[PDB]
Design a protein around this ligand. Structure first.
Ligand SMILES: Nc1ncnc2c1ncn2[C@@H]1O[C@H](COP(=O)(O)OP(=O)(O)O)[C@@H](O)[C@H]1O
Lengths: 89, 96, 96, 149, 67, 25
């Protein structure tokens, strides 16, 4: 949607990896079946020993889910943001 | 915030690379007689502002992530400094 | 005619001349070239008959000049009749 | 009639469009670009089909506060203007230098002396929007350079 | 049918560049621009640009071969 | 094309649009 030339960078898939890691740390994403914190140490003992599927599948195929719905994004994201128009479908 | 991260590394990492071995070898090689430590800070400071603006969308609003790119790229950034890169960071940016 | 006839390798001259304003499609232009000249309608010993003309079917994606060639065979063959699929009726083709 | 350079620009643009389909564009769309350029020049006096007309036909066939188009119009003008001094090697441009250039590219579109200050004020605001989007990297003059993206 | 000509509109930069540069020149020539003789010379001149055989002869040549 | 490269006019650009405005009527 831009006039052409009469004679915005797409970041590489590698550089996005650091960007992807930040979103999992800040709890915007979460794993598909993330049980989370256990209640007791004995229960956590099993968790620290067991190896789930997500710890072995590749970094680019770990299924996540979202804590914020696009409606809440559109309620919070400033309208001055360029991607505001992409908040909806 | 983005503004604070820029200022934090300016206050923290300025003195770190003003006294590294790599530059003070190159300064003698380039025979920069007019160099001063006040210039030395701003020369290193320009590197932080550029790398932040270059990689803020990459690293994020993170201090830990930025503190390593300021290390790896620094010797290579040091190499491109010549007699013509002392006063104009724009040309130094062009070389690097 | 015989001056051109004695030219070495005349076949590729005719094929290259089949609708020259269409790029490529040489294995299709040869079918057009072969159908325009036709074969021998051999009425074998009278009691048996075989058709002589070459039938060609052009099939492919839109934007491949499958129709404009048929707008060229009309202008090149001695006698040509053009028709369109839905615009033609069974009675209108065979006899009325 | 199609100009000689228009042929090269047209084949380049057709290659660019055909790249994206790895609907789907056929050579009918190449003829359509030729025909749309013919129509646009038909809405003008000059028979020379400059690459500019093919650019408009390409954009129209491909596309299938401040208003969106008015702001985006400022984008290509300033993006390529800065890329000029990259090839030229001339001095880089400040915000004011860019704004002075822009208004003189549309002297005729201006209507009133009051609008002289209105669009000038809008240009600086667009600069902030562009820098905020990080298409220009600010260095120190307040030097604006093509951001490393 | 005797000959079936399957056509694929596959995508390739080298194939596209050759085909497009041919078509863009085709619209250059098919576009308009003893006067009878002078202009008839021009038409067969453009036939020589693109065809090894003059088209009028080829029509007759096909007719002669068929007969 | 990029013909308007160096029309380095003075503050008369305000007077430039007076001609655009005052004569249009
Ligand atoms: N190989 C080709 N060389 C030159 N022009 C072509 C070629 N293929 C298609 N075209 C152009 O595309 C158009 C195709 O028209 P048409 O024959 O109706 O397509 P279809 O194959 O769907 O019948 C023509 O106008 C022609 O100019």
């Amino acid at each position: 949607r831009i006039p052409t030339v009469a004679p915005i960078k797409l970041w590489l898939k590698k550089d996005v990896k650091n960007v992807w890691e930040n979103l999992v740390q800040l709890d915007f994403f979460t794993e598909k079946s993330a049980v989370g914190l256990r209640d007791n140490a004995t229960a956590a003992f099993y968790a620290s020993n067991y190896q789930f599927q997500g710890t072995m599948i590749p970094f680019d195929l770990r299924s996540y889910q979202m804590q914020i719905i696009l409606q809440e994004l559109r309620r919070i994201i400033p309208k001055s943001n360029m991607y505001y128009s992409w908040t909806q479908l | 915030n983005v503004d604070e991260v820029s200022t934090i590394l300016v206050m923290s990492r300025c003195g770190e690379l003003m006294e590294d071995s790599c530059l003070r070898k190159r300064i003698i090689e380039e025979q920069i007689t007019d160099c001063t430590d006040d210039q030395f800070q701003n020369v290193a400071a320009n590197f932080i502002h550029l790398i932040v603006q270059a990689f803020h969308s990459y690293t994020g609003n993170d201090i830990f992530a930025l503190n390593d790119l300021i290390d790896f790229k620094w010797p290579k950034y040091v190499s491109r400094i010549t007699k013509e890169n002392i006063f104009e960071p724009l040309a130094l940016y062009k070389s690097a | 005619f015989r001056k051109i006839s004695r030219d070495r390798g005349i076949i590729d001259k005719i094929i290259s001349s089949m609708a020259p304003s269409i790029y490529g499609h040489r294995d299709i232009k040869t079918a057009v070239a072969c159908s325009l000249f036709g074969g021998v309608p051999k009425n074998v010993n009278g009691k048996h008959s075989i058709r002589g003309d070459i039938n060609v079917l052009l099939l492919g994606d839109p934007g491949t000049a499958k129709s404009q060639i048929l707008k060229y065979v009309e202008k090149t063959a001695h006698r040509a009749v053009f028709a369109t699929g839905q615009g033609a009726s069974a009675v209108g083709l065979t006899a009325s | 009639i199609l100009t000689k350079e228009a042929r090269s620009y047209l084949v380049e643009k057709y290659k660019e469009l055909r790249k994206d389909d790895a609907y789907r564009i056929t050579v009918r769309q190449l003829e359509s670009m030729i025909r749309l350029s013919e129509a646009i020049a038909r809405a003008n006096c000059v028979d020379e089909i400059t690459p500019s007309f093919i650019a408009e036909a390409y954009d129209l066939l491909r596309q299938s506060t401040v208003t969106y188009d008015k702001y985006v119009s400022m984008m290509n003008m300033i993006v390529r203007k800065i890329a000029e001094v990259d090839r030229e090697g001339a001095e880089e441009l400040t915000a004011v230098d860019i704004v002075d250039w822009y208004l003189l590219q549309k002297e005729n579109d201006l209507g009133s002396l009051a609008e002289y200050w209105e669009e000038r004020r809008l240009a600086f605001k667009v600069i902030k929007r562009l820098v905020k989007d990080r298409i220009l990297m600010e260095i120190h003059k307040t030097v604006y350079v093509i951001h490393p993206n | 049918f005797d000959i079936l000509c399957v056509v694929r509109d596959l995508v390739d930069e080298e194939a596209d560049e050759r085909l497009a540069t041919f078509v863009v020149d085709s619209h250059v020539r098919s576009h308009p621009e003893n006067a009878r003789q002078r202009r008839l010379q021009r038409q067969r001149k453009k036939e020589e640009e693109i065809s090894p055989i003059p088209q009028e002869l080829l029509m007759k040549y096909i007719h002669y071969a068929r007969t | 094309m990029y013909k308007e490269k160096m029309p380095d006019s003075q503050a008369n650009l305000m007077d430039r649009l007076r001609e655009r405005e005052r004569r249009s009527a």
